[PDB]
Structures are given as C-alpha cells and as structure tokens.
Structure 1
C-alpha cells in the first residue's frame, strides 16, 4: 500500500507523534510502502498512484494550496492529519490580523529586526493566502485525525483500519468521559470566573466548577485528558465532537448558561464578558479558521 505524507502550515508535531509509534513505526513501515515524506526521505515530487495521504497543517500560503491540490490529485485517500489540517490550529490566530500586520511585525517592527529599505520578503517565497484555512476548505478530504498532535495509538488505529479496508471511526464523546475529575451530580454552576494563575485548583474537583474556563466539555475525547490530570484546564486542542461545528460558540453557550445559574434571575449578565479580556483566545485557540466567523474584519 503506497502512502505519502506532507506538511503545510503546521509545526511538524503530527509527524513527530507518528514517529512516537517508536518500535511500531518499523512494523508500520514493513507493511506500508512510504513513497514520499519530506522529513524522512528525499523524494522531491509527489509520485503518482498514492493510495493514502497524510497531510499535516492547514493552508497558510500559496505553496500550501498547490501541494494540497497536487496531493489530492495523486492520492486516492486524503487524510487531514491533525488539528491544523482539520480545524486550522494555533496558526489560525493569525486571522485576527491582516497578513500585512503579520509580516510587518516579523520583518520590520520586532525589537531586534533591522530592515532599512523596509522590504517584505518577496523573492522565491510564496505569498500568504488571505486567511488560514482548514484543509477541507480547499480540497476534498476523505478522513481526518484530530489532536494537536493526535496521540500515536489513534494514528495507528486509523491507518491500519484503512490498510485492512475498514472505515476508521473516531471516539465521539466529549472529554469529561476520560477525565478522572469529579463533578457535582446537581450539575455545573459557576459563581465567578478565574484566570488559570488565580487561586489553588483542587486536584480532584472539576476545574469548570471551580471557575476556570476549561474546554473539556466542548472537546472530543481520545487523548486521555492529560492536561486536567496534570493540573491545568483543557485547552480544546482535539477540537469539537462530530455534533458541534463551532467549538468556541458552543463553549460560550455552555459557559454563559451555567454562569450564576444558581442565582439565575438576578446575576448581572455583564459580569461574564467583563471578566474575560481575551475571548477569541479563550475559546478559539485551535479551531478559529473553522469557526463560523474565522477572521477579524478590518
């Protein structure tokens, strides 16, 4: 089975997680004919007759667009490999600014930068597309593996399923399933909102009920919930479940519904927006390019 990988606007983390199969990477490569993979081999052009393709990263520049289209033509099955390819990922926060603001910061107004003619790199380099886009927005994507990065076992199950000819199926519940923290059977009620540096979070009580914006409730399971286990709220990196399109919108709906719910008719509805200084960054860390409004208008 000829497979190929490539990367676009990601950070290489999905490929590193693939290598974190460790011993199993060799067993995988014994059964698979890897015909293209920039990080591991020197095949420059994407060959024809690729059966499966792992594409990491979203679309950030014109070159990403052409490679995504070339891989779609060459590959039978295109897989959106990771959260960036599936939802846009952290680089999607660049949509909150124009490319000119992104470029002028990196190449003019950064404190150590020295550029006397004020040039923006433009020779032999691609221009950025207008906004970071999920892979499915520019090509047809047959499957996707969420996670930032996707855990190594999950990458193994998806691929081996396709080698066998079976459809891969991701887990469907939200994170609270896997998480070992204890909830109130009376339900979630939030009195105040705390930034993650405030107070001392109790190790066993659900962080959302303690007042911390935790994305576990709006995030698909599968990772094992290591962040809440390790003492910090979930940031939502795995993305939403199959029944939620806009992860940030749903988290906001849930958060607002239960804020002051024990005092429903009297809690001031302006306390919650005033306590959150960075709202897009609180709720759209990994998924902004796939939200209903994936940019800031200028």
Structure 2
C-alpha cells in the first residue's frame, strides 16, 4: 500500500508524533510503502498512484494550495493530518490581522529588524493566501485525524484501518470522559472566571467548576486529557466533536449557561464579558479558520 505524506502551513508536530510511534514505526513501515515524505526521504516530486496521503497543516500560502491540488489528484484517499489541516490550527489566529500586517511586523517593525528599503520578500517565494483555510476548504478530504498533534496510537489506528480495508472511526465523546478530575453530582456551577495565573488550583476538583476556562467540555476526547491531569485547563487542541461545527461558539454557550447558575435570576450578565479580555484567543485557539466567522474584518 503506497502511502505518502506532506506538510503545508503547520509546524511539523504531526510528523514528529508519527515518529513518536517509536518501535512501532518500523513495524508500520514494513507494512506500508512510503513513496514520498519530505522530512524522511529525498523523493522531491509527488509520485503518481498513491493509495493514502497524510497531509499536515492548513492552507497558508499559494504553494500549499498547489500541493493540496496536486496530492489530491495523485492520492486515492486524502487525510487531513492533525488540527492545523483539519481545522486551521494556531496559525489560523493570523486571520485576525491582514497579511500586510503579518508581513510588515516580521520584516519591518520588529525591534531587531533593519530594513531601510522597507521591502517584503516577493522573489521565488509564494504569496500568502487571503486567510488560513482548513484543507477541506480547498480539496475533497476523505478522513481526518484531529489533535495538535494527534497521539501516536491514534495515528496508527487510522492508518491500520485503511490498510485492512476497514473504515476508520474516531472517538465521539467530549474530554470529561477520559478526564480523571472529580465532577460534582449536582452538576457544574461557575462563580467567578479566573485567569490561569490567578490562584492555586485544587488537583482533584474539575477545573471548570473552579472558574478556569477548560475546553475539555467542547473538545473531542482521545488524547487522555493530559492538561487537566497536569494542572492546567484544556485548550481544546483536539477540536470539536462530530456533532459540533464551531468549537468556540459552543464553548461560550456552555460557559455562559453555568456562570452564576446558583444565582441564575439575579447574577449580573456583564461580569463574564468584562472578565474575559481576549475572547477569540480563549475559545478559538486552534479552530478560528473552521469557525463560522473565521476572520476579523
């Protein structure tokens, strides 16, 4: 089975996670036929007849778009590998700014930059596309593995299923399931919203109930909830469940609903918006490009 991989506007994390299979990577490579992979081999061109493709990253520049279109024609099955390819990822945040702003900062206004001419690289480099777009927005995607990056075992499971001829199935529940933190039997109730530095969290109680914006509730399980287990809220790196299109919108809905529920009729509704100074960066960290409103006008 000829499998091929490539990367776009990502960080390479998904590929590193593929390598995080360790001993099993060799076992996997004896079952598949790796025909193209820029990080491991020198095969420059995407070959014809590719059964499965693992495309990492979203569409950040013009070359990314070409490659997506090229791999889509050469591959029978295309897989949006990771959160950046599936939902847009962290780079997506750049959608809050124009490309001109993004480029002027990196090549002009930076304190250590010395550009007297005031030029932006344009020779031999591709132009940036209007906004970071998930892979599904430019090409037909057959399957996807969510996670920033997806855990190794999950990547094996998906690839393994395709090799067997079966259809890959992703976990459907939200993170609280895997999460070991104790939940109140009466239900969730939030009193005050605290920033990650405000306070000393209790290691046993649910972080959302303690007043910290934990995205586990609006995030697909699979990762094993390492963030709350380590003492920090989930940032929603895996993205939403199959029944949720926009993760941030849903995360807010939930957060607002339970805020001051024990004083539901008389709690001030202006406490929450005044408390959260940066809303987009709190709920659309890894999914802004896949949101209904994925840019700032």
TM-score when normalising by structure 2: 1.00
Post-superposition Cα deviations, 1:49-86, rounded to whole Å, max 9, x if no partner, equal: 00000000000000000000000000000000000000
SS at match of 2:277: coil
Q: 1:233 deviation in Å?
A: 0.3
Q: What is the alpha-carbon root mean square deviation over aligned residues? A: 0.4
Q: 1:151 deviation in Å?
A: 0.2
1:111-122 alignment, distance < 5 Å:
111-122=111-122
Write the distance in 2 (CA, Å) between the matches of 1:213 and 1:77: 37
Aligned residue number for residue 273 of structure 2:
273
Write the distance in 1 (CA, Å) between the matches of 2:74 and 2:212: 46
Aligned residue number for residue 6 of structure 1:
6
1:207-222 alignment, distance < 5 Å:
207-222=207-222
Write the distance in 1 (CA, Å) between the matches of 2:114 and 2:96: 25
Runs in 1 of length 4+ with deviation above 4 angstroms? none
Write the distance in 1 (CA, Å) between the matches of 2:174 and 2:73: 35
SS at match of 1:173: coil
Write the distance in 1 (CA, Å) between the matches of 2:221 and 2:228: 13
Write the distance in 2 (CA, Å) between the matches of 1:31 and 1:181: 39
Write the distance in 1 (CA, Å) between the matches of 2:204 and 2:61: 44
Q: 1:185 deviation in Å?
A: 1.0
Aligned residue number for residue 128 of structure 2:
128
Write the distance in 1 (CA, Å) between the matches of 2:28 and 2:183: 40
Q: 1:206 deviation in Å?
A: 0.1
Write the distance in 2 (CA, Å) between the matches of 1:146 and 1:285: 14
What is the count of residue pairs matched by the alignment?
Answer: 297
Structure 2 gap segments, 5+ residues each: none
Q: 1:274 deviation in Å?
A: 0.2
Write the distance in 2 (CA, Å) between the matches of 1:120 and 1:52: 37
TM-score when normalising by structure 1: 0.99
Write the distance in 2 (CA, Å) between the matches of 1:27 and 1:76: 23
Aligned residue number for residue 258 of structure 1:
258
